């Protein structure tokens, strides 16, 4: 699971954006994460589930790049 | 982390009692567990943190036994 302060990749629409986890919570055997999209307004901060996020690894950054290159 | 429905050992005072996890929640990087002590009044159902609980393993059951014998 993702930790508070952790930088991640996050979908917002079909592209991946760098984000930071502000809060992590689990109820009913499900994680939710309140994320801030880096360089975006705080108005876009929101709760998301695991399926919206990727660990900030070079492997997942390559996924970000592939999506950028295929437009 | 313990799961809903899981039987555990729980301190209530210095002895260990079998209990069941009713609900598990995590906030601020901390699990809490709402437990029912088996055979006890529902009045005693309560939220506890990890320090109050032990996995139902043979080693921890042996700890329960040791505490009973040193009573």
Numbering used by the authors:
A (entry chain B), B (entry chain A): 10 to 80
Give the authors' words.
MRG family proteins contain a chromodomain at the N-terminal and an MRG domain at the C-terminal end. As a “Royal Family” member, the N-terminal chromodomain functions as a histone reader that specifically recognizes methylated histone markers. MRG2 and MRG702 have been reported to be involved in floral transition, a highly regulated process in plant development between the vegetative stage and reproductive stage. Herein, we study the binding specificities of the chromodomains of MRG701 (the homologue of MRG702 in rice) and MRG1 (the homologue of MRG2 in Arabidopsis). Both the MRG701 chromodomain (MRG701CD) and the MRG1 chromodomain (MRG1CD) specifically bind to H3K36me3 and H3K4me3.
Only MRG701CD in complex with H3K36me3 produced crystals that diffracted to 1.4-Å. There are two MRG701CD molecules (molA and molB) in one asymmetric unit (AU), and the r.m.s.d. between these two molecules is 0.140 Å. The structure of MRG701CD adopts a compact fold with four β-strands shaped like a β-barrel and a C-terminal α-helix. The trimethylated lysine binding pocket was formed by the following five aromatic residues: H37, Y42, Y62, W65, and W69. However, no extra electron density was observed in the trimethylated lysine binding pocket. Comparing the structure with other MRG chromodomain structures, we found that W65 in the aromatic cage was stretched toward the center of the cage. The indole ring of W65 occupied the binding site of the trimethyl group in the lysine side chain. Two MRG701CD molecules are related via pseudo-2-fold symmetry in the crystal structure, and they form a dimer interface along the β2-strand of each molecule in an anti-parallel manner. Specifically, both E50 and K52 on β2 of molA form both hydrogen bonding and electrostatic interactions with K52’ and E50’ on β2’ of molB, respectively. In addition, W56 on β3 of molA contacts W56’ on β3’ of molB via π-π stacking interaction.
